[PDB]
């Protein structure tokens, strides 16, 4: 599913991401924009052999099982394919664990490089939320 911007903001908000670990909703929308272009089916191989999955590009080295990432863990206790669903529940539950791991949203390199410190409120402008 390719979410619209406000459509994703509303779903993330409903799932409790707004101000989760202190990160406002626009941070999460910005991260999803640059991680997946709001496409739940996005997948991208990393150089280490892991793969990132779904709207928030959650990686298989630590967070989900894809059966092809040697030495990796599955700390969200889910198959990585569950992160590609139209329904973002699994991705959000897993993202909550990631952003709690110690470095906050810096875990998403694209957030650090493209969203951190910017006017992230713009990502929720116009939305009836
Ligand atoms: Cl915001
Ligand atoms: Cl881009
Ligand atoms: Cl894909
Ligand atoms: Cl992989
Ligand atoms: Cl995801
Ligand atoms: Cl594996
Ligand atoms: Cl393969
Ligand atoms: Cl393994
Ligand atoms: Cl999803
Ligand atoms: Cl933080
Ligand atoms: Na894994």
């Amino acid at each position: 599913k390719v979410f619209g911007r406000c459509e994703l903001a509303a779903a993330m908000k409903r799932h409790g991401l707004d101000n989760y670990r202190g990160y406002s909703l626009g941070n999460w929308v910005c991260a999803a924009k640059f991680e997946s272009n709001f496409n739940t089916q996005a997948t991208n191989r990393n150089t280490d052999g892991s793969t990132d999955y779904g709207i928030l590009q959650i990686n298989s080295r630590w967070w989900c099982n894809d059966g092809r990432t040697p030495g990796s863990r599955n700390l969200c206790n889910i198959p990585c394919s569950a992160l590609l669903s139209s329904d973002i529940t699994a991705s959000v539950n897993c993202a909550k664990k990631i952003v709690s791991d110690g470095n906050g949203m810096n875990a998403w390199v694209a957030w650090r490089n493209r969203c951190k410190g910017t006017d992230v409120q713009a990502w929720i402008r116009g939305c009836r939320l």
Side-chain angles (χ1 to χ4, degrees):
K1 173 174 167 171
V2 177
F3 276 75
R5 179 177 60 83
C6 291
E7 185 185 19
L8 183 62
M12 286 179 152
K13 181 173 182 178
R14 168 168 45 93
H15 286 286
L17 283 179
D18 186 17
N19 239 67
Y20 191 90
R21 287 276 162 170
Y23 287 92
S24 64
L25 190 56
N27 281 284
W28 296 103
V29 178
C30 185
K33 170 68 182 188
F34 297 123
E35 288 296 355
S36 66
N37 208 19
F38 305 146
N39 186 350
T40 68
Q41 300 195 75
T43 62
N44 292 284
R45 203 74 183 263
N46 303 310
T47 68
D48 72 356
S50 68
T51 300
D52 290 344
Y53 295 86
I55 59 164
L56 286 167
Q57 294 287 280
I58 291 176
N59 82 67
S60 66
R61 185 178 65 169
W62 298 100
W63 303 108
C64 60
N65 178 54
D66 66 7
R68 66 166 200 195
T69 309
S72 73
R73 304 276 290 266
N74 177 14
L75 297 173
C76 293
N77 310 302
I78 52 171
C80 297
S81 62
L83 300 172
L84 305 181
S85 179
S86 286
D87 180 327
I88 70 170
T89 303
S91 281
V92 172
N93 287 342
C94 188
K96 288 175 176 175
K97 289 188 179 61
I98 299 166
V99 73
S100 299
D101 196 53
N103 298 324
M105 290 192 75
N106 297 290
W108 288 274
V109 166
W111 179 86
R112 181 172 56 80
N113 287 330
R114 306 181 72 177
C115 300
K116 180 177 189 181
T118 76
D119 176 22
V120 297
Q121 193 273 331
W123 291 99
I124 63 172
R125 215 157 285 155
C127 305
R128 255 281 261 304
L129 292 171

